[model samples]
Target chain A: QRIKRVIGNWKMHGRLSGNQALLTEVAQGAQAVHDNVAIGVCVPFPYLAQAQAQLQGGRVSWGSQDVSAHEQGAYTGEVAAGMVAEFGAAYAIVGHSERRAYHGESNETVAAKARRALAAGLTPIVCVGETLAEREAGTTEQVVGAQLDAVLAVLSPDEAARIVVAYEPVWAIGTGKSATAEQAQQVHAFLRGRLAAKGAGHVSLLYGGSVKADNAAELFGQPDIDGGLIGGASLKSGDFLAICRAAK
Target chain B: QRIKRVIGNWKMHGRLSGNQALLTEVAQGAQAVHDNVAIGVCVPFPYLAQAQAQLQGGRVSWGSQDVSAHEQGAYTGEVAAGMVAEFGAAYAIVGHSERRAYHGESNETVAAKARRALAAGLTPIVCVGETLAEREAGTTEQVVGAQLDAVLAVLSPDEAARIVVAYEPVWAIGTGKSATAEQAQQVHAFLRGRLAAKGAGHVSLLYGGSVKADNAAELFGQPDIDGGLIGGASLKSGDFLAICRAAK
Candidate 1:
């Protein structure tokens, strides 16, 4: 139903030389564009410029790890979407588990950020996920649905279609353990089914949780799992290319 | 007793073209050498690279509005000090009133960020100020003291000396009203006296509260007022330069 999308979330990592080296490698591989899949990297705010300078005319697109909910002014450490619009960001990650937990971002705030990103012409890759406990308690759907509904609540059906959704189980992110294909698909299917009624089914659905090269194909093979919002594997050029290969 | 400083806090402001133009103007002004004062601009995280590129070899220096209290890893949407180190960031503003009020940063956490900046070889320009309510309640000294004490409590003599402190009255920041020169000097004197006992009294103490060129000299002329952490005026070239001239 959709193109495969692979996005590397270089979360809180990358320095000058390290970023240049990684982007150079990633860009080199993305040049072999696959019609069935799209690739992007969401980097920390500081590297948005560097990422743009290196990847600007390349096949690999770039984005920010987070976008400020506010447009601009007086919110001292925040980066407004308008600022990064000039950098050619194809996407901006919103409501990632880290932000929700550490920075206290509410669903309403996350939705506002998505609106800002969409207004700035960057697609908002909205992240909705549940914790390990919620999964154990059989409330995964409840948790993620509330998260997704918050965004869907504010957006028109047309506006919501431009968004991308990534379901990253909190226990799985950065924990080395990933959701099983069935587990990931169950969530993705619920997501699509619930949103299909709202006319947002065509929006790309991604799975994120320790996604790697060897297991990427198995996960990508699932019906509703369109692609991944990668964390660690996206940092490796060959590994990412191998997964990109699996998608095509 | 202190070297003058003029730091522009481009507070949650600046897009690509506007920033480039602003930095170019500020850089042009800094080209004229000053004997007693240092010039710097604290930009949003996204603009660090651009600021560094424009100001690195020039007389003016650059910094960030905030640094992560956590060092690195798993802290999404946070910028670490080490990341900015590679960009030749000479300073990083921490615990600005905006952060304390809006982002829920406590005195202790702000101190930790200052420690992180110092560890990464960037001077933390620590800001300590009281709200209008606190000042009205006559607890301004008590409030600001505890904030500074938190950082001083953790720093060794050498490490503490590497930090800069700014006295920004929350009511005054971006509000077009500044503390009277006497009011500002009184706070700076208290700050220096507190640090002097800890062998860091000589550390540069800057005043930040809607500082402009016309009022800069009078504030900078005070005994304990080392410089100004400028806000709106920094967006104007001649205005910032006039402040710079006041320092010389």
Candidate 2:
């Protein structure tokens, strides 16, 4: 397994020229440090081809920010996992907190999306988290635990190995708030223990939400925090590369 | 306004590599034609950046198949019209039948989306149509007229000119059951007359649904059927180009 990894969620940014500029910058800056870490950029679906063209044959990989849980049929306005896979994506983000909040995606739907991603031969980066209220109520562990349970219940131990778990506390995501290293480590360790009990200990566990170059090194220093799923900071090539190097 | 226009809705298709291939093909093909027609491709959201990059400085323009009417902030899974406009999209498809059927997009919502598109300085290709049942019940005019009226109710005549109406009879879409030339023309002429009465005489009227090379010429030959909003046939380069030629 790779020592460390960095995934950029461009959220919903980039036009054609902007994407070209961003990708060109990342390709140029990050190429030198490729051997030490795994890097990925998840852009809006329309830019996937350009991202592939720019990053192809390079160390960086690209993925979709989301894939539909609904199977291929007449579900308008939704993109299926199979279609995302066909775009040469190696990963797909499933159950991101934003999606759960905005689209009313449930744990069942997240699990379905995970299954679809795996079925299409793409790795599913299953995102689990606790909202601010849940955290304040000291129910963070329970919230994340239940989210993980949904996927675990649906997938076999072997299938789970193919999954990547991203722990993005909703409170910290894009809010200029970040979990302290100690705070994040506790959840990562607990998650690892929980998965290990389910016989899926090998899955990669990533920490996300307001992760930046300045704080990334300390987060990476935590034994259980294997990598990061960065947001705004990842849009800038210099900042993104800095975080990637910190993981190294 | 170009006599022949080709619009391809990649409808939840493509990833990085697929985006590259399709964009490359379109760019190259567009360059080769040097024709009088306009070429547009509406890809999934993630690939919009790629479209901006690959289609820029070329004869082709690009857009998203759908967009949110919301202004911005915390909508979660949606890409707002501002975001779509920021991507350098020249047009955005509003109220596609699929969105209406699957996502429960109301005529009011569709009208709002059109307003958003205009606010963003992108042309709104407003789609109006009747479902198979509606058409079978001989309520095609009533249904489509209501759909158009919803938009007209909200937008002024000047704002309406920034729109291109796409008449996509739901039954004919992806069902291989095309509306015959006379049927399409009747609806189109009626739509044009309605627009003319609203002081939007300059608006382009496009016929969509199962449009193919084999029937494109006959459809385009109709006095009021200005062009097409092609579907499955648009996936194939030759077929799509042939339809564009027919429009010419």
Q: After aligning candidate 2 to the native by TM-score, how far in Å is the CA of A225 from where it should be? A: 2.5
DockQ of each: 0.77, 0.24
- Per-candidate RMSD, Å: 2.4, 5.4
All candidates' lDDT scores?
Answer: 0.86, 0.81
Instruction: Give, for candidate 2 chain A, the lowest lDDT window spanning 10 residues.
Output: A69-78
What is candidate 1's lDDT per residue for A1-248, written digit by digit as tens?
A: 67679888888888888888888888887778576678889898988888888988767888988888989877888888887777888989999998898777899999999999999999999999998778779898889999999999989999988999999879675566666889889889999987897898888899887777889889989999889988877777889788877776
Count of clashing pairs, candidate 2? 19
For candidate 2, the lDDT comes to 0.81
Top-TM-score structure, candidate number: 1
Error of 1 at B179 (Å): 2.8
Q: How would you encode candidate 2's per-residue C-alpha lDDT over B47-156 as one tens digit per residue?
A: 67677878888888888787777664434346667777767888888998888875578999899989988898888889999877787899988989999999988988
